[PDB]
Design a protein around this ligand. Sequence first.
Ligand SMILES: N[C@@H](Cc1c[nH]c[nH+]1)C(=O)O
Ligand SMILES: N[C@@H](Cc1c[nH]c[nH+]1)C(=O)O
Ligand SMILES: NCc1cccc(Br)c1
Ligand SMILES: NCc1cccc(Br)c1
Lengths: 408, 408
Amino acid sequence: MVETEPVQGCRDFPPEAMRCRRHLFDVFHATAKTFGFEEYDAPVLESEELYIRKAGEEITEQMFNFITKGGHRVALRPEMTPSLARLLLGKGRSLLLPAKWYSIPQCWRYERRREHYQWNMDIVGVKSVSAEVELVCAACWAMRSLGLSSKDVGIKVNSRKVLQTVVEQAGTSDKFAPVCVIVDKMEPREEVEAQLAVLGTVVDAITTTLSLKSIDEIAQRVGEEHEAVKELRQFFEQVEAYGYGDWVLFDASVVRGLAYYTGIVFEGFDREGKFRALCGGGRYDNLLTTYGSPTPIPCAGFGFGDCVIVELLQEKRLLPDIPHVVDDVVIPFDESMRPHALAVLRRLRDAGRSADIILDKKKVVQAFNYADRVGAVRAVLVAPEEWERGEVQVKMLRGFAVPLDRLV
Amino acid sequence: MVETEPVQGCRDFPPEAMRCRRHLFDVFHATAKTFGFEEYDAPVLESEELYIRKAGEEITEQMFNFITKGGHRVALRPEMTPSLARLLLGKGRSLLLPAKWYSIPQCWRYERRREHYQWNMDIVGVKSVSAEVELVCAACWAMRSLGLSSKDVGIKVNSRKVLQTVVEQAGTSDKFAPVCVIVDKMEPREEVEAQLAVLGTVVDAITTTLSLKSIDEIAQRVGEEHEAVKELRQFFEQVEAYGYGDWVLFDASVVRGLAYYTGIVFEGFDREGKFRALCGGGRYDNLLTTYGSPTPIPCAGFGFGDCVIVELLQEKRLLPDIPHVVDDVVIPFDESMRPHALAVLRRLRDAGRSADIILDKKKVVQAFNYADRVGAVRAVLVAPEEWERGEVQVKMLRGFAVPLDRLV
Ligand SMILES: N[C@@H](Cc1c[nH]c[nH+]1)C(=O)O
Ligand SMILES: N[C@@H](Cc1c[nH]c[nH+]1)C(=O)O
Ligand SMILES: NCc1cccc(Br)c1
Ligand SMILES: NCc1cccc(Br)c1
C-alpha cells in the first residue's frame, strides 16, 4: 500500500483545509485589489545564484536546493523578493513606475514545516515613506478583514538607518548586514554579544539604541532631524491620517533577519505575546543595484505567511468551519427522468447557479440527504407527473410545484 | 549582473501575462463552482514511488526527479491524479461519496517547456457514465465560457473496453496498459506495429478496431449490448439532453497515454487540426485498488492544460489584452494635502472601491496621466479650497466638486 502521508514537512489540502486556505487567500487578493496592487508570478524553481548573499541569513542557511542532471545549481525558492527583483531587472526601462505588485507564492526550506505560502506585497519606484505607509496599512487591512482588531494585533516599526549611523561611527559597512542578521536574534544576550565579537565597545552602543523606548529618545541621540526621525514621524502621521494609528507603534529592537533592508522595517505581532511574527518587511533601496541595475531602484514590501495568522485566528475563534455550499441539487425521480433532469441542470447553470445532479442511482430520500450533506440551498425533484405539466418540485433546505421558467 | 531569464523551461508571469492566466483560471474556478466541484491541493513535491507504474508512459519517462540530502527519492509531480488518489486513500471510510474535487496544479517534466498548469477535475464513487458525462460537459462549459463554440472545438470519445476484449481474446492482461501506451502514439504505422512486436495477428485486430468509424460498426464487431456500447450510447444521450451534443463525437482511435484508464476516455481538439489535445481524461476504476484500497473505488476525471488552450484562444482572437483597472486614483494637490487625501483614500476603500493614492511627489497633470496609465475610472483631486468646503474635485476618465459623503 502506498504511503498516504505527504512528503516530509509538506501539507495536504483536502476540501476542508482548502476552504480555510481559500478564506485567507481571498482576503490577500481582496486587499491587494482594494490597494491597487497587480498580481504576478514566477517559477518556484530558481537559480541558486539568486540567493547567494554571504550575510549568514537563516533564509539562505535553510535553503532547499539541489542540482539538475544537467549539473546546474537550483533551489525551490526560500522567498519571493529575489524573483521579483529578477523580473523588475529584466523589464528595465520598459516598466512604468511606480509599480505595485503582489503574489502568494509557496516558499520552501530544508532543516518541522518545509513549506508555507506567503503573501508578498511590494512597491517599486517610490522614494518616500508613503510606500511603507501603504504596505503597513495593507497588512492591517488584511488582518481587520479576517476579523482581528487593533486590540488583537499591532505592527512594530523601526528604521535601520538609526543603527547604520552607530555601526558606521564605530569605524566597515560590509559588516552592517551581518550585524542586522545577528541582532535580529536578540529575543540570548550572551549568544548575540558573542556573535558580534566573532564578526570583529560598539556592541554596547548597538544594544543601547535597540533598547531606546521612543522616537523622542532616538531624536535625543541622533537629533530631531536625522534621516530616520523625520521619516518615522511622517510614517506615523500618515498611518494616523488613514485611520490605523491604533495598529502601529515604534520599537527600536525591530531589524528583521534579511540582509537587504536599508530603511524602515516592520513586523506584525499578536498583543498577547503568544505567536511568532505575523508578517514582516521593509525598504530595500539597494537590492536592484546589487543585482546590476545601472540606476538605483527604490523598493519596499513585506511577506505575510499562512501559518501564524491561522494559529492566531484559531485562538481568537475567527476560523469557524464554513461548510461546502451549492445552490441547487437536481434529483431525477428515477433513471427515466435523467434526460429531463439534465435539461433542468443546464437551465440552472446557464443562469449562474451552482448545481449538482444526482449522478448515481438512488432513492429520493437518500438523494435529499445527499443534498443536505453537500450544503444545498434547494433540492429540485424532476418527477414524471410534474414534468408533464411543465414543472418540477422544489424544496428549500435552509415542497412545491414550480414551472420550469420560474426556477431561475 | 544576475541572469534575468527564468530557469530553463519555466515561465515568468509579470502582471500582463498574469492577467491572461487569471482570465483562464477564473474560468476553471467558475466552471468548477457551477458544476459543484470542491477545491483541493497537495504538495508539488511527492515521493517518486507514487509514479512507478512500469508501463512505459511518456509521463513517467519524462519525470523531474531528484534525491534529498536525506537520500529519499522525490519528484516534482508530473501530474495530479496520483496525489488525488493518495489523498482519497488517506481518507478511506471517512470520505462522503460521491466526491467531486478539482485543482489547478503546476505540474512538471524534464527532457522545450518543463512546467504547465493543469486544471484537474475528478469524480469519485460514481460507477455510471453520468460521471464522464458531467466531466465532458464541464470541459465544454469552460471552453464555451472562454468564447469558443462547437464550431471551434470538439471532444472525441471512446472506451478502452472495446480494445480490452480484443487484447484478451488474443490470449495477457498485464500487457494491456503497455498496449494502450503504444497505440496512443499512432498519429507512424511502422513504429507502432514494431513497438507491439517488441511487447510480444493481434496487431491487425487492434489496428482494425481503432479505425472503426462509428458505434454501430463497433456494435457489429462486439454486439449491440457489449459493455462499451450501452455505456457510449448512454453517454451520448445524456450529453445531448444537457444541450452539448454538437460538442461531442465518437472516435475509436482515442486511447490516451496513461496506464490507468479502464473505461471511457476522451480528449478535446480544435476542429481545424492545428493544435495538440486541449484536454484529456477518462475512467480509472482500478487505480485505488493498485494503491492498496481494500474496496474498489470508481473514479473518472480529466486534465486541461494552460498552454494549448491559450494558443487556440490567440488564434481565434479571443484573448484581447485587458488592461489593468482601478476605480479611483486620489491625488493630493500638494504634500500639505496628503493627510486629507489619506482620509479620503480610507473612505473609498471602506466602501469596497479599488483605489490608489499618488505615493510620490508629483504635479497634478502628471498624477492624472498616471491615473490614466493604470486604468483609473475616476481621478479624485484633494485640493485646499474644496477641502475647506468639505469637498474634493472628481473627474471621470472613461471636473466637478463633490462633497465627501457623496463619493461612495
Ligand atoms: N522577502 C521578505 C519579505 C519581503 C517582501 N518584500 C520585501 N520584503 C521575507 O521573506 O520576509
Ligand atoms: N492525469 C491525467 C488527466 C486526469 C485527471 N483525472 C483523470 N485523468 C493527465 O495528466 O492527462
Ligand atoms: N521562515 C522562512 C521560511 C521560508 C520558507 C519556508 C518556510 Br516553512 C519558512
Ligand atoms: N505532457 C504532460 C506534461 C506534464 C508535466 C509538464 C508538462 Br509542460 C507537460
